[PDB]
């Protein structure tokens, strides 16, 4: 029976540790949890994941373990200070044993000096750091180089999950790595991450705030009489009907109506008839801020969902939203004939 | 002259309100930076909540005399906003006063900024710094030309008194102390800008006392019970070094007015049950390390701490060449006669 170690410490990224444990879990291998210390009860970070360890890094053995599985959030923070963590990380990578690390995992990696050379991934948080490390940095949902598996996020816990079990002899029922149509959500939903319930609301979250910034938009160019920035609002607009449509073709997948929920609902008719007036330099700091709050909320959602496709929208809008601040700051800098005010944004979060 | 202070969620909350309130106090102008408006940023501690005056993404470097960036988990959150750290590489390139204190030189690393500079950060990312070219030194302030940095909440006082001197501000009604001074009752200045009080730092040195007490107690009555000469040696010396820890948590103790003294206070299963006691302090102990805004106390946690890390080896080392010396399989034992 093959034996793993999860490593674990205070507020772990909690789908990285219960996805790998649980899928570990289910193949028949026993999982050992090896924390700092026994008797201390570990929180994830998001408050769902509490357990204490069946062992500790100390006298923790290398030889004993055919995997060491690294999960992220803010606990490699923690474990890298660890100096028998990293010993035996370091032990368990000099011995051929698997390594696996995601999200900020590769921070430990990073101790031990173990990225030089490698090809490997983590989250865009520490890439600098992995390439300073000496590693050759892919923006990839994974990456193995021989022992060495590393995924970026949640999204790709399904994928990560799945080189490891399948490099343990066990690879059903499962999907290859390189399947390029594999439902990965799905078998990230079987080993405790985001259900269909979880993705959906996300996939609206981000559907609603579009389509609100979409009717503010088209209120502010009507209002912009400047033909340049009316262009630039007119150019936002056609970028927010291109996110709308992403959002309502995979909630159409995922058994979705959204146009005709939409329809039913009118959520943002009051964002027209709503009085404002019409002062052109004002249009440009609601732009500013209303797209400051996309970021924020659209940021939060790229690391909330163990889906790699809705994962992927939401990065593909923040990816937008980033390019579009930019050129409003730049249209607002140079519209305005003293210091600039700072961003305001017409909704909350 | 104007001061911008970064801001992101999760921020250790002393290490944003220390440098802002003796910036406010010195009579500059503060400017939160922060990634949105209307976002109320919260403190890793739960204490601090604020919005921001202004955020990176409009605000002009130039405009700035320094630009202070704290830390706690807000570094992993400033690092991925662009804007910020462009903010920080204008600052740097035109020759402000770039202030990093803890995870705040990340926004540094993230910038390329460190090649070949002198700095410190939290040890934690010391690998990361040294890894983007920094000369890393374990200190309480590292100055290289306009880029200053610190540690952890225990130099915030002599951060911002840093910070405060290169800006030309040597105090109100009366002088603050220099940089340089060894003497200095840093603690004091930190609690007079929002940080650790006597209160909170005598009950950091009775939590570390406590602890060692009952680790002091354990070892007692473990070495008693040993059998094995090497191993009961171990338990001995470890003694005596909780006796000297106890001496200092009590004599730094008396120096902020407690008496310490008025208050009521088989063989590989011994060297086990060590290093269990010995990991509960490691967490216990390295906790008190970040919590207090007074270098003293944190100095002393720092030394706990690294006594017990040392010892955590030997007994592990001692524990593993037990175990390899143990027969397989076991001869069987009866009762007596």
Partial sequence: KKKVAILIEQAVEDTEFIIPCNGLKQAGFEVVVLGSRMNEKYKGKRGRLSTQ???????????????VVIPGGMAP????????????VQE????????AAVCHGPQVLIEGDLLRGKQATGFI???????????????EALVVDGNLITSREPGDLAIFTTAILSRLGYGGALPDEKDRNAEWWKLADAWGGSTKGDIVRGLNT??????????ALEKYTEKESDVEAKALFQE?????????????????RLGEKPSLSANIANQYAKVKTALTGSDDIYQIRSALGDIQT???????????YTDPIATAIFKEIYKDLVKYEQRLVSLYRTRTNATVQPPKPTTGA
């Fill in 53 to 67: 360890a069946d062992g500790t890094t100390t006298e923790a053995i290398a030889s004993e373990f055919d995997a």
């Fill in 77 to 88: 923070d923690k474990m890298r200070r660890n100096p028998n963590t990293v010993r035996f």
């Fill in 92 to 99: 368990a990578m000099e011995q051929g044993k698997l390594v």
């Fill in 125 to 139: 948080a520490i890439s600098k750091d992995m390439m300073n490390a000496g590693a050759d940095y892919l923006d």
């Fill in 206 to 215: 981000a559907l609603g705030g579009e389509r609100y910034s979409l009717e």
């Fill in 236 to 252: 936002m607009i056609t970028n927010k009907q291109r996110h709308i449509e992403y959002l309502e073709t995979y909630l159409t």
């Fill in 294 to 304: 996309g970021i924020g909320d659209i940021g939060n959602l790229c690391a909330m």
